[PDB]
Design an enzyme around this catalytic site. Structure first.
Site, PDB file in Angstrom:
ATOM      1  N   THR A 100       0.787  -1.232   0.000  1.00  0.00           N
ATOM      2  CA  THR A 100       0.000   0.000   0.000  1.00  0.00           C
ATOM      3  C   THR A 100       0.814   1.274   0.000  1.00  0.00           C
ATOM      4  O   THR A 100       2.037   1.241   0.141  1.00  0.00           O
ATOM      5  CB  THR A 100      -0.855   0.022   1.274  1.00  0.00           C
ATOM      6  N   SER A 141      -4.713  -2.952   1.102  1.00  0.00           N
ATOM      7  CA  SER A 141      -5.179  -1.596   1.407  1.00  0.00           C
ATOM      8  C   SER A 141      -5.391  -0.814   0.125  1.00  0.00           C
ATOM      9  O   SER A 141      -6.266  -1.036  -0.706  1.00  0.00           O
ATOM     10  CB  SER A 141      -4.249  -0.962   2.438  1.00  0.00           C
ATOM     11  N   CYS A 142      -4.673   0.204  -0.239  1.00  0.00           N
ATOM     12  CA  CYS A 142      -4.734   0.990  -1.468  1.00  0.00           C
ATOM     13  C   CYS A 142      -4.166   0.292  -2.706  1.00  0.00           C
ATOM     14  O   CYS A 142      -4.350   0.778  -3.840  1.00  0.00           O
ATOM     15  CB  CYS A 142      -4.016   2.344  -1.314  1.00  0.00           C
ATOM     16  N   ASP A 164     -10.745  -4.825  11.366  1.00  0.00           N
ATOM     17  CA  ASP A 164      -9.873  -3.784  10.799  1.00  0.00           C
ATOM     18  C   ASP A 164     -10.269  -2.416  11.337  1.00  0.00           C
ATOM     19  O   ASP A 164     -11.443  -2.032  11.193  1.00  0.00           O
ATOM     20  CB  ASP A 164     -10.005  -3.861   9.278  1.00  0.00           C
ATOM     21  N   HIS A 179      -5.716  -4.773  10.397  1.00  0.00           N
ATOM     22  CA  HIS A 179      -5.583  -4.341   8.998  1.00  0.00           C
ATOM     23  C   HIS A 179      -4.446  -5.043   8.269  1.00  0.00           C
ATOM     24  O   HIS A 179      -4.578  -5.293   7.067  1.00  0.00           O
ATOM     25  CB  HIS A 179      -5.377  -2.831   8.937  1.00  0.00           C
ATOM     26  N   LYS A 180      -3.350  -5.340   8.955  1.00  0.00           N
ATOM     27  CA  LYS A 180      -2.186  -6.000   8.395  1.00  0.00           C
ATOM     28  C   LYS A 180      -2.279  -7.525   8.616  1.00  0.00           C
ATOM     29  O   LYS A 180      -1.476  -8.128   9.339  1.00  0.00           O
ATOM     30  CB  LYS A 180      -0.869  -5.465   8.972  1.00  0.00           C
TER      31      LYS A 180
END
Length: 256
Positions: free
Chosen positions: A10, A79-80, A206, A234-235
């Site tokens: 990300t 993520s992104c 998350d 999140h990770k």
């Protein structure tokens, strides 16, 4: 079955975020590539040299160009990183067996490329001690950011060990979402991005890509398959590394 996985970090991150998952996938027999995107990880460019999400994606596009005919890969974006996947797939759809989204943005083909980013900023507007700056490239004003250490600790790396959070403090760099550039970009195409198989992986624990946002994305653009990982953060490639590898093995045995 064995596959070639291409792991895509990300913004403000680098290949290093995959340092636990890559060896685990290799111990299952897969080939793994973990790229540094432009101005990321140990790439020698600085973000102020980069003018758009497409330029940001150069090392992924260059990698895909270099695959000999007939070789396909499974893209995995966190993520992104989903935006990099969509950009790649509108250039190299024939080399992509499937795309896996890992607590990631899921762009579509009916709305502008900034659509899910705009929604993310609605759902999660407060990036805490994150700092912002502006630079100009190709006549456009771009907003750069440096992820704040409190935000990293509490929202991105919530349940990660101190030695992993430390790596994030040491190695995260200034980057950009290029939000305003995406907002004026041509739409992702249906024949390209639209045609690839999409697997959506997420956890409801998350603390930045909140359940309201991830469930919104799933309803907005139906994935081919959804996997929900219980627990973690999140990770997930750090907190649920084995579960992510198990899922990716199943994807390898499903899509080629």
């Amino acid at each position: 079955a064995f596959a070639h996985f291409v792991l895509i970090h990300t913004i403000c991150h680098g290949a290093w975020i995959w340092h636990k998952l890559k060896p685990l996938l290799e111990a299952l027999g897969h080939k793994v590539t973990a790229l540094d995107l432009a101005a990321s990880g140990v790439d020698p460019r600085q973000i102020e040299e980069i003018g758009s999400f497409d330029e940001y994606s150069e090392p992924l596009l260059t990698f895909l160009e270099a695959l000999p005919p007939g070789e396909k890969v499974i893209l995995v974006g966190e993520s992104c990183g989903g935006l990099n996947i969509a950009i790649a797939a509108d250039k190299y759809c024939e080399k992509i067996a499937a795309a896996v989204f890992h607590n990631s943005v899921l762009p579509d083909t009916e709305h502008c490329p900034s659509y899910v980013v705009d929604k993310l900023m609605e759902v999660f507007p407060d990036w805490k001690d994150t700092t912002y700056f502006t630079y100009t490239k190709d006549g456009k004003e771009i907003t750069g950011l440096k992820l704040g250490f409190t935000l990293l600790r509490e929202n991105l790396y919530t349940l990660c060990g101190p030695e992993e959070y430390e790596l994030a403090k040491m190695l995260t760099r200034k980057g950009s979402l290029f939000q305003n550039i995406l907002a004026k970009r041509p739409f992702f195409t249906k024949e390209g991005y639209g045609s690839i198989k999409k697997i959506y992986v997420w956890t409801d624990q998350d603390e930045i890509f909140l359940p309201e946002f991830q469930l919104w994305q799933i309803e907005n653009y139906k994935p081919d398959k959804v996997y929900k990982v219980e627990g973690g953060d999140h990770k997930l490639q750090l907190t649920k590394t084995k579960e992510i590898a198990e899922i990716l093995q199943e994807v390898a045995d499903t899509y080629n």
